[PDB]
Subunit: 126 residues, 8 copies
Amino acid sequence: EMSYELAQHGRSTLPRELAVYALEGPFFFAAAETFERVMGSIQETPQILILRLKWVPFMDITGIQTLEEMIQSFHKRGIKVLISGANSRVSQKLVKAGIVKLVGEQNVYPVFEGALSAALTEIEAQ
Amino acid sequence: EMSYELAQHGRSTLPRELAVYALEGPFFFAAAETFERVMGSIQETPQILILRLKWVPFMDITGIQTLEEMIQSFHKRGIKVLISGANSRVSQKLVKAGIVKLVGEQNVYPVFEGALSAALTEIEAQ
Amino acid sequence: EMSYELAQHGRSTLPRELAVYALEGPFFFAAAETFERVMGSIQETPQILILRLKWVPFMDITGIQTLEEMIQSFHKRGIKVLISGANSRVSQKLVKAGIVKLVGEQNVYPVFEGALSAALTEIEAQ
Amino acid sequence: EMSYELAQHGRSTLPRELAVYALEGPFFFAAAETFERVMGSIQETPQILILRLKWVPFMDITGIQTLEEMIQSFHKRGIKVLISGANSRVSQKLVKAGIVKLVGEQNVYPVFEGALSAALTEIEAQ
Amino acid sequence: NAEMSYELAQHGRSTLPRELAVYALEGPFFFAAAETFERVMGSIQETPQILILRLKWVPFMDITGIQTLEEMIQSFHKRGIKVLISGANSRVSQKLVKAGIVKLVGEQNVYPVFEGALSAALTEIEAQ
Amino acid sequence: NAEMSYELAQHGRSTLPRELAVYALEGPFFFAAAETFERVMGSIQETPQILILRLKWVPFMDITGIQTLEEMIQSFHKRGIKVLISGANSRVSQKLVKAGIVKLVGEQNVYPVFEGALSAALTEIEAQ
Amino acid sequence: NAEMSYELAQHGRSTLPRELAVYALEGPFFFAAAETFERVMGSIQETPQILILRLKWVPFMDITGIQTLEEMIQSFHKRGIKVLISGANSRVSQKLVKAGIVKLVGEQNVYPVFEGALSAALTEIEAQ
Amino acid sequence: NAEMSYELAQHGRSTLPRELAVYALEGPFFFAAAETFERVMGSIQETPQILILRLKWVPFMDITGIQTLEEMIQSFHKRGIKVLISGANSRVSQKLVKAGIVKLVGEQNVYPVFEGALSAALTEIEAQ
């Protein structure tokens, strides 16, 4: 939960440097497309984006290439991307596809709370 | 509830001058984009729009800049915008981001019924 | 139910001449926009379209002008449009807005089954 | 279930050659449009796509022509398309519309598990 | 229920008549619900002439659900309640036949669709 | 419940006062829920002065639900609890009148909308 | 349940055979449901040869759920019912082992996935 | 529950330890659920050392829910179970104080958020 981790860091709201986005379900294409557009369209971008993968039951090559394109459009704007919540099958697929390599193994988290904690800590050390 | 407040004002339907829109969830981007397009596209615009924020659990800088852009496109068409239902965290974020300043502190309401009552009253005083 | 009325007419499937579309919820804008595009884009169009309004809790001037535009794009392709399921408040708004006049009072039905029955009968008398 | 069939084939994840897409509900137009765009936009395409029709209660001529266009855009990229889960009414409509002819009668499956099994087997025989 | 709304209007009504009751089994594990409704039907002073049992939300039935349903219908029959069944899916439809449920209520009282059952019930009540 | 939130604030409160309780019948087969709440109301040491029964989620009522509701309200009245009804749809509203439920609670205690009932309850409690 | 549909067809059936029953624990607080099903199984005249307990919707288990589940399975075993378990998540799977539930039903009767359990049950019933 | 997953891992566990149980009141009309869980807790041979009652899904409480909750906690205390409360919303939080529930469980045992309660419970169990 966002509430608990924010409070452990003396916060009530998400800091400006941090954004969170959840992949809709297995067919996150429409929603991913729009968010990519928003990210490329807004004046100011966050330092860190957490992509929540909890609601993704599986991924085929269409999801993989979509997510790959999505992360690259974030990186090119200086956004560090963290991944959280992939089930055990999607976790395997992300390694297999080179997505873990793409974000960095140290940026993939089994659970959202781990990613949020690490994001808040990185932001504070600054 | 819309029914109760309409009836307190001797009404069964929303008056032509009043529109209501609810932000989808935390990722209201797609839906906000379409409504912005509709608002800019229709011949006649309402005098007052109430944006319901009840279903928004948090907002990052991407939501903030989206909502900011959205409200500005409404203002430029002469639409007065009211905000309702922000939870206690989103309420803080809206102040922090300058969105409360943008709509006017007197146009932000803890609960939908307060905003609807005040909208119906403003419309009637005319 | 579609099953019961189809069977009363000796049918198992919707006849080619008949289409059915349901307005998403109060903010049917995105979905209405896409269906308008589909209707204008496909080679063959149905003779009769039933628009189901059951899931529409209220309508403001933005919904009204959207729905108005939508119905006009259908009429210009020779599509007869029926409306069904409007609650008692939306029913009033549709009269008020001139939408009942636009489709014809005889084409508005309190309940989906009435509209479907009348559509199947009109199609058969041919 | 995907888990059981994958395991019967000695697998934990969907093979790269196989994609799965589910038609949203009766008004799958928006989502079908986006996926068509994705399929035509990505560098690498799967060998086999399974379209799940379980959540489609009925289809009119608008859905039919949409789905027809969708499948043709897949075929032109060398994608073999399987259909699964059509209820007994939609099953009839698909024959009636020439969609079963279009994908091949041997590529239509009453239930998702049948389609997935047959897809995994075809992929392995290679 | 708009299906109910339409059939009522066809028969000149806006409300369910006193003689008719409608009950839905929800999900395959309707046991707790069946039990309470059986209790109410035995407990209330005034019983309906016809009960419609909607089975649309029952995806399968094993022997436990079958005996539960049998017992439930038996309780209604002993109070003089005529029971109609509607909306069994294709496989539950076959189970109902094989297990003697259709026999118990009568072939003429089993309806593929709720609206057929409600239409037939409203017609029977008017003729009485 | 933001409807509750707004009415409480109008009356200077943030919480429901001790004298007021709210209960919702959920779905047309509220029997099991009715039964347990009847039990609690008989079992607890301290009863509220006013109970609001929200009927918004009740799409129709047959004779079984009516007698269930009658019995439930009778149990509350014998403990001195004043019962308000709110949110009956258009057809349930007519049933309530025809079956003697409105008679049982009083015409002045039936409210088309929850917020009217809650407003009236908060006002009555303040005057006491 | 299409998973059920597919396995039935593989075995030449369209309906669940009389010898097989399926029950799902829904959510971590399955106690009230467990209780009623235990009651039905003790109450019905004819019991199935095999029961599958689906645990897919059970996200965690504490000692209260464990003893509830133990007791439930014990009631089924005394009526001669062979119990299969399917779909425990990764952590509930470890709990089941640690608490003696797997011991109670047998290792060979615990299935990662419902379809494996149903396949195995249909095969065992055919061999009998 | 990923919140549970994360806290367990922080403490080196994958499963809830035997000493800890978690129960959630779902919706404002938790009476039937409260009743059954009270029954189970009295019925099982082995009780947990700590129970967390999650109140996140409870939007308001009237006097009936309060006395129901009081009674429930009293039953747990007499079996030696330490009770923690978590997730009361802002108004339920004030009700709990005003009605003597916080007094009943102890101020130090009431947690704004489930994760704080679970962290504190896992720490207390380790120290024992």
